[PDB]
């Protein structure tokens with residue numbers, strides 16, 4: 001078995017190897033990369049996502065989210081308070097303000113210490129989930145707005161034609177902006193490209209050990225657990241590396257820098273934080289190996305997790321028994 005300790009693997013494809021996206025994913029899996037839940041891909045030196053970032057300041061963040069925490073430093077939830085619209089230029093200036101900027105630090109490890117010590121005492125503002133793309137249309141390799149669609153994968157594997165579309169999302173981050181512990185909708189893959197700015201630190205649990213994280217989360221968030229049988233789908237709960245180590249949960253960590261891709265694999269729980277002003281682009285995707293994960297994925301039916309138009313069809317075809325109750329949650 002390849003990668004039996006489930007370590008995060010880092011790949012350096014040549015420009016020749018960067019042509020065929022599906023084939024490279026399948027290569028990484030042949031080496032065991034999926035066992036970690038997360039992999040890093042460093043693009044060939046010749047590749048670029050676009051020529052410059054010089055003209056992005058007029059993108060609008062229609063609903064910036066203030067991430068307010070409750071709990072203790074290592075075990076907390078966050079809620080998202082909606083703020084007034086602002087441009088990317090306005091948000092960058094805010095991120096660089098004395099109130100919101102990255103503090104002085106020695107290295108990534110000192111910054112990680114300061115994040116876990118201090119996160120809960122501040123409420124950073126995240127421009128998340130903005131439909132759009134920063135890839136130039138002429139970038140032919142690993143262009144996240146030109147991938148094969150999940151609907152077309154389901155049709156190729158299973159023969160069934162379904163409605164829905166699959167488009168990318170932009171994330172504008174600042175110091176302390178946080179992504180809670182989650183897997184993807186329908187336990188899909190995700191791919192994330194850090195276009196510019198400061199790094200993003202990731203934590204991940206191997207897919208084969210995901211249920212260990214779920215059991216800890218039910219113990220640590222006991223009212224949330226009674227409210228919903230899949231409450232990590234609400235994307236609100238944080239648990240620190242120190243707390244995971246104290247409870248024997250297997251995990252790994254890695255820092256993504258500008259110009260690098262990350263891939264999350266089906267049922268790979270992940271969480272993390274931004275080091276400073278940055279912009280990432282991400283999208284879900286599928287392969288043949290995903291289909292069985294999609295059939296087994298948990299679902300939120302309490303009504304909190306409220307998800308896309310395109311997830312309807314996935315539930316309806318892969319989980320027809322759940323269909324009914326899950327759509328009661330979504331209406």
Ligand SMILES: O=C(O)CNC(=O)C(=O)O
Pocket residue numbers: 171178179190191192264270280282283
């Ligand atoms: O970058 C973020 O805030 C969150 N991204 C992801 O969870 C991902 O790409 O799967």
Ligand SMILES: [Mg+2]
Pocket residue numbers: 055056057058059
């Ligand atoms: Mg602009």
Ligand code: NI
Pocket residue numbers: 182183184190264270
């Ligand atoms: Ni994710």
Ligand SMILES: [Zn+2]
Pocket residue numbers: 227228229230231233234300301302303304305
């Ligand atoms: Zn729920």
